[PDB]
């Protein structure tokens, strides 16, 4: 629906929030993760950013569903396309393994997915949607607006800047100290893994 236009505008909006409001959450090799109180739920909106040694198309094609999508990502354990509208409008379901010696159990997510051009690059966003089929093995997490911005690097055409905004509500019951750690590490590892998947 027109939900995609709104999802798109929300993320461009987040991408306009300037540093002043972001609080460092973790500093990795070549990835920085920040967070700020979410205006969507009682949790945080995360910002992650780092350079990728590859072009936009290749980076985004590895982030969306396909051949080796579960292959490089240590946290995703399954991925299903449930409803496909336009080539760039999906409704997917994916599960996530347990984290922190099981302090966080396997999650399930059913998100709307939308990929569109952004500047000279691309925007691949999403938000969770209502889905009845439930499974006891997985607690359903809920993703508020989130997305990945990927655009060519300044004056380096062979590279690109990958910026992500993640606003996940893992639901269930987890102490905030574990949630904080988990989310910060999930984003940092996503870049490590993604860089390996690109090979």
Curated annotation (Swiss-Prot):
Induction summary: Down-regulated by dietary cholesterol.
One annotated Gene Ontology cellular component of this protein: endoplasmic reticulum
Catalysed reactions, semicolon-separated: cholesterol(in) = cholesterol(out)
Membrane-crossing segments per the record: none
Tissue: Expressed in most tissues, with highest levels in liver and in kidney.
PROSITE patterns in UniProt: START
GO molecular function per UniProt: cholesterol binding
SUPFAM superfamilies according to UniProt: Bet v1-like
Keywords per UniProt: Lipid transport, Lipid-binding, Transport
Annotated START domain residues: 1-199
UniProt GO BP: intracellular cholesterol transport
InterPro entries xrefs: StarD4, START-like_dom_sf, START_lipid-bd_dom
Organism domain of life: Eukaryota
Pfam families for this protein: START
Keyword Transport: yes
Matching PANTHER family: STAR-RELATED LIPID TRANSFER PROTEIN 4
Role summary: Involved in the intracellular transport of cholesterol. Binds cholesterol or other sterols.
This protein's name: StAR-related lipid transfer protein 4
Designated gene of the protein: Stard4
């Amino acid at each position: 629906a027109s939900i995609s236009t709104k999802l798109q505008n929300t993320l461009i909006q987040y991408h306009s929030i300037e540093e002043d409001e972001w609080r460092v959450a973790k500093k990795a090799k070549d990835v920085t993760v920040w967070r700020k109180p979410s205006e969507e739920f009682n949790g945080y909106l995360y910002k992650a950013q780092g350079v990728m040694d590859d072009v936009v198309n290749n980076v985004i094609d590895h982030i969306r569903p396909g051949p080796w999508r579960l292959d490089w990502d240590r946290l995703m354990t399954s991925l299903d396309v449930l409803e496909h509208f336009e080539e760039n409008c999906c409704v997917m379901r994916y599960t996530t393994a347990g984290q922190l010696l099981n302090i966080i159990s396997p999650r399930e997510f059913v998100d709307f997915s939308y990929t569109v051009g952004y500047e000279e690059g691309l925007l691949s966003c999403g938000v969770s949607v209502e889905w009845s089929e439930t499974r006891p093995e997985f607690v359903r997490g809920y993703n508020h607006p989130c997305g990945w911005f990927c655009v060519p690097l300044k004056d380096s055409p062979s590279q690109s800047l990958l910026t992500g905004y993640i606003q996940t509500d893992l639901r269930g019951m987890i102490p905030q100290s574990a949630v904080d750690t988990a989310m910060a590490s999930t984003l940092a590892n996503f870049y490590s893994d993604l860089r390996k998947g690109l090979r």
